[PDB]
Amino acid sequence: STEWVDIVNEENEVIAQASREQMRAQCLRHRATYIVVHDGMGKILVQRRTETKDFLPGMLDATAGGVVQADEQLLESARREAEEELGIAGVPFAEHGQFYFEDKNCRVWGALFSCVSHGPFALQEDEVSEVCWLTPEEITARCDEFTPDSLKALALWMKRN
Ligand SMILES: [Mg+2]
């Protein structure tokens, strides 16, 4: 089935809907959720992207989450992503506002969430190839390995937590 995605203007108003392929082909501005999954003891669940991913294959994500699909509300979208990527469901999510990120390959209004989970996790190997618990110190010591958008989300979380 084709994945359909909300396309937004500069003001984060939905003005278009595109296939996932069109979104990536034209670098269209879209929404995504970013969820800091932390263990409540100082560590962040970090996820290595498979090497088949369109956006930044093989890099580390400091957050779970993904593109918000057509007509999805932000929290249900975050919950769907966490369920699909990590096999978690019914865990409390805290909301931490929004941020905008763009580089040469994407334009995104991000919605930031966090949750505390110790697992267990059920992962998708076609998307994530590895997970581990890292402290924020450990992450910044390796920050060249991380997607800049997930790093931005984490940094924003770290300044609130
Ligand atoms: Mg997705």
Tokens representing residue 42 in the block: 């100082």
CA of 81 to the centre of ligand 1 (A): 6
Q: Are 132 and 145 in contact (CB under 8 A)?
A: no
Domain boundaries, the chain: 1-161
Kindly report the number of other CB atoms within 10 A of residue 128's CB atom.
Answer: 19
81 assigned to a ligand binding site: yes
Rg value, the chain, Cα: 15
- The upper half-sphere exposure of residue 114, i.e. CA atoms within 13 Å in the direction of its Cβ, equals 21
Resolution in angstroms comes to: 2.0
CA of 76 to the centre of ligand 1 (A): 13
DSSP state of 68: P
CATH topology classification for 1-161? Nucleoside Triphosphate Pyrophosphohydrolase (3.90.79)
Would you give the end-to-end CA distance of the chain in angstroms?
Answer: 37
Residue 50 DSSP SS3 = coil
